[PDB]
Subunit: 510 residues, 3 copies
């Protein structure tokens, strides 16, 4: 039961960018990235304004009476344990992203500084990175993750993003001009969003290899590294099961090694001192950073935001469908309040520690003179931070392998989700159609890395913002659909009608 | 049934300042404005400290159990629709004030800067203006608006500010040393508060005319512009009814034209980018600006505050009686929570957009070189912002007419309120006594504009702070009376006594 | 019934530091203060991170359902009146501390400035002092004060800090590797914490005398001033009762005189203008100061924090046992919510006014040129602020006497608490064992002032951070024990079970309606098909 109504237009746009970028109209793709700077100028306020709205909206709901509502049958107990649920939360907290920017981002802000602040500022350097990897991102994943976890568990609808727009569009009739389109953009936004992490994984590994087999052009090398792990996703999907479960555990171990290694070896105390700093400062500059637009100070932030804030915002939106589908399944029959409150606190905890370790020591070195700053190369900075520590050559390989495993897990999980959306929300997607999207995502992966050539990272970040632009309004509209569904929920109505009886009972007696 | 006990002392003080200012002791009036700088030094902390207290106090009540209480009969449904109620909220959001400072204020802060911050700072420039036209002002209007809407709807007392002090002063016995005095100051504070907006409307129009009939002295011109609309308030009160209803609708349209025109024509994107900025930054610098006193940094803010923060604070207080009487009638039998939460959110929404458009583009031009800064003239800056845009000469006239309509609506509405306070809270005041206060307010209007002459704006802002000083403590005390009334409501009071 | 199990190890460590500091290994004591800078480097984040946690934790509990719980018998009415309870709250708000730093602290921040800010900044100068004497300190006193006031009133256990760890350690079995140790550290942390205030009282008075009998070496003078009030604590404990009650009232009067005097005489308006400033600014820089560590800006704050933030934090922790025992008795059968909400608001109100008056005028003078800055001497700055005002020579003596009374009240109250912990939580401690700890505390008092010599203040602040380090984790663990006790309360456990049954009953009733509408629906489909 393959819904080709979504598959066709999806692959059409997917393969389009692939061919229109990999070759022929190569320089034309980089022209679209230039005309893309227009969306940052126009819909710039959109990503920023609503970007914070997601945080307030998801907190208001969690705090309101809707929080008591169970995600499924009335008064249903969660399947997985409380601790087990939190453990699966860390699995989502770790990704190729933290491996990439985790060490560079906090450093680039300490060296260059952020719009409206002095340079060499530890406090602001952390508050910014925190502002990009904590509440805001997960506030978007919670909205989507809740929109699904409610419509498919509580109401009992199909596992399609369109099924969440039932209240708005039309009950069951949401399969015309919209609905299908929502499911179409859902896949397109996901394939590009995942292609980003996969692409970042390539440059990350490539720069890691340029720190082992020194040296080689490395143009073909990129195509190699990609297909290497791209081919080993099949033997971890079809012929072999339990791939996501096993590899995820291995990832947590390797990620724990790097985190601990840098922690004990590097400036331990300094890292620990950053825990209260990054956290406290984050709460201080929150609204100041939330009000940061291309008008402060004097339209100077425009360039900065477009390559940082605006980027992440779009990158999370394009990734919301995947993370949403994930958090939904993990939170079976779990209170809305504990679901939201658990999605914003647990993951945000990992991002805090991770950045305080890598992005922390990287700053400590910048202070002591041993600048890890690899002449700009963001990918070479993670390994540079390792080689600067006793046993760096070793951990450098471990971190490199961890990337290869992430590339597989990320692509695997993202594929099982995309395949589901292509099968009318079938929970048990075929390991064949799943692998199909696997190469389809990696295809767009290299296409973005080759079109940019030397500026692969520049073009990669750009294309991401493109596919996310349309899906942005989807999440904004998904915000209303989630409000109407709740306002028409059994427990909710039963509450307002029971409260109206209590406010009328002691009224007549008076 | 005219309560002359309040009328006499009111007109006595009103006409006093009129004559003692319009002529004879002219230079003596400007001497009182100098000795007025003493109230900014002494009671300076009062306006600032409590100024924020109003915000916390009105939010705590709205959040507390008192919020569930209906403004009238137990479990009574509001008269007007939810959307209709919000629409009437915008009618109060729009005024002569936004037309005046809406374009200049955000600019003067971007050019000169605020105490304790660098200049040419967009973020701080917005946070400040927001700090003056959002929560704080309406937190004062909500307290008064609720004090009335409760005492006259719930309890069922007369529509007099003194009737709200029943819990404190004395039940029904609040008509001696106090009560009447509270009603006296209520009118005096209102007539001066309204005279400010009317005065600002004059200078605004006058500067608009100096951009059409260029040129003429303009001394008599001011007296003309005023009496022109001052005489057409009668034909919109007595001989003609539905004045407030019709004109209010026309005001919203014209105000929508200016707002949209500048929005689409000017830097659209920039304006939109200021929505998250002004809002976000406002929440960031809130407590920092709330703690801003004449001691930071190093008693340097004293001069700045006295001509900005301290000013608005007094200007809102002197206007609280009017806005309070208004919001009360509009919110018939409406939950206290939705009343407060609706008074702080709806109007504050307009002020955000309005300042992000006019005060926004004005900054965008300041950045691009086309400084609209009309050599200091605040009134000439609004029109300068228009003439800088395609079709400015047209909108300049539209905005000018909109001011004339505001001058009438503001004076009309303010009069119907003052007349009510002079008739033992009679909801249906006479269209004759109403028009009486009409000229009485405009009288003080010109008196403040002529006494200053060239510094008409300087003297106008000053006299305002004077009449508000006494009423300040009234609102502070009105804060306690609103707490006792609520703590002694219906089911709540009886429940405590039954537990005693 | 003296619990020597705690007394012995306590006096052993107490007398140890006394002898090992007063003489012989004198320079060795100052060596421990150098190796002490290591705890500020290592556990530095601990004091800062959790330091704010205490604030959030104590606010969450007060806001939660636990707040409705009464501190004693179910639905028990408080003994003292609401106003009387607030009055006894001010008695705790006033101390030797405010007399010492109240005038200097806000000044040193206006002159030198704080890490990450410009100098001569009034706003930041107040926010910092506020950050040290408001929520944070009392958030620690509330946690301890509640841990006791609940375990001894509600549950009905002995008045020992160890009795509060019953949930964690073991029910009644908390008297082995732990428990006793918790009671041991409780006294040690208290004796050192009190010794600080007593020591500060000495230097304060000594500098006051150097402003009257000008002049004299003053080395022996310190030993005199101390023993003078140290000997008059006995005649105010044994031979005379009602000492704490009477003197406390006298302290409030004298403290009111100084506060008002400086208020009316000095820059009145300026002080009043600081009320909104200090308060407002405090809320603004709260999280910014809460995130202040030895990494901002660029590990430069390390030195500053170690001599300010880190100090107070440890000083409050080492004093938590005493203040906790106090607030507990004062809040008999009083709602947890009104207890916490009353401990964080009332005292924080005094600290705001006190600093806005003394620390306020001191800045006003610094602005007008008449710098009260007594060439660094912190003790000579309070009197300098007085002598600068009409009738300073008079108030200088009054403030000096007020210090002597505080020295007695502080030592007296601290002793009655330490003695209680040495008698299995006996509420009625002996006036003999109480006086015993009196000299025991003053002993460590002079020991810290003589070991430093010229840098008496430097060494005094250091030794304090030492004894508090271990007790820090005790308060962190006491945070968990307070959560388990509450989660297992009668009124509480009834509230949850009730909230469940009420949700199951409604659950059942709803299911029956869905089958009702479904049965009734398909029924009308047969009436229309067969009409």
């Amino acid at each position: 039961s393959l819904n080709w109504s979504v598959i066709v237009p999806a692959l059409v746009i997917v393969l389009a960018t692939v061919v229109w970028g990999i070759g022929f109209k190569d320089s034309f793709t980089n022209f679209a990235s230039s005309a893309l700077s227009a969306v940052v100028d126009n819909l710039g306020w959109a990503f920023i304004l609503f970007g914070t709205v997601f945080v307030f909206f998801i907190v208001v709901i969690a705090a309101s009476k809707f929080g008591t509502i169970r995600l499924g049958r009335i008064d249903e107990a969660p399947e997985f344990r409380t601790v087990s649920w939190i453990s699966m939360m860390f699995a989502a907290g770790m990704g190729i992203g933290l491996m990439f920017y985790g060490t560079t981002e906090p450093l680039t802000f300490y060296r260059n500084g952020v719009p409206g602040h002095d340079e060499h500022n530890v406090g602001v350097a952390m508050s910014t990175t925190m502002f990009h990897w904590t509440l805001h991102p997960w506030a978007i994943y919670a909205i989507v993750g809740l929109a699904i976890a409610y419509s498919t568990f509580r109401v009992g609808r199909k596992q399609l993003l369109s099924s969440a727009f039932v209240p708005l569009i039309g009950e069951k009739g949401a399969e015309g001009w919209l609905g299908k389109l929502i499911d179409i953009l859902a896949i397109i936004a996901t394939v590009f969003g995942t292609a980003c992490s996969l692409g970042l994984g390539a440059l990350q590994i490539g720069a890691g290899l340029s720190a082992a087999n020194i040296i080689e052009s490395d143009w073909t090398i990129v195509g190699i590294v990609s297909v290497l792990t791209l081919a080993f996703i099949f033997s971890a999907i079809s012929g072999v099961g339990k791939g996501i479960q096993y590899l995820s555990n291995a990832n947590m171990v390797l990620a724990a090694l790097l985190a601990i290694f840098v922690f004990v070896v590097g400036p331990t105390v300094s890292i620990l001192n950053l825990l209260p700093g990054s956290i406290g400062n984050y709460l201080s500059n929150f609204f100041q950073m939330a009000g940061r637009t291309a008008m402060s100070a004097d339209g100077t932030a425009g360039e900065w935001l477009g390559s940082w804030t605006i980027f992440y915002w779009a990158w999370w939106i394009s990734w919301s469908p995947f993370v949403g589908m994930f958090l939904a399944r993990i939170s079976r029959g779990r209170s809305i309040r504990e679901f939201i409150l658990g999605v914003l606190l647990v993951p945000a905890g990992v991002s805090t520690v991770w950045f305080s370790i890598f992005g922390g020591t990287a700053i400590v070195f910048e202070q002591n003179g041993e600048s890890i700053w690899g002449d700009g190369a963001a990918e070479e900075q993670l390994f540079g931070l390792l080689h600067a520590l006793p046993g760096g050559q070793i951990m450098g390989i471990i971190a490199m392998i961890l990337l290869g495993t992430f590339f597989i897990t990320s692509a695997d999980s993202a594929s099982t989700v995309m395949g589901t959306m292509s099968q009318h929300g079938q929970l048990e997607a075929n390991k064949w159609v799943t692998a199909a999207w696997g190469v389809a995502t990696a295809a767009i992966g290299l296409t973005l890395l080759l079109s940019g050539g030397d500026n692969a990272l520049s073009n990669l970040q750009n294309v991401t913002i493109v596919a996310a632009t349309p899906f942005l309004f989807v999440v904004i509209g998904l915000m209303f659909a989630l409000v109407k569904d709740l306002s028409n929920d059994v427990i909710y109505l039963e509450y307002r009608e029971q409260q109206r009886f209590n406010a009328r009972l002691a009224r007549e007696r008076r």
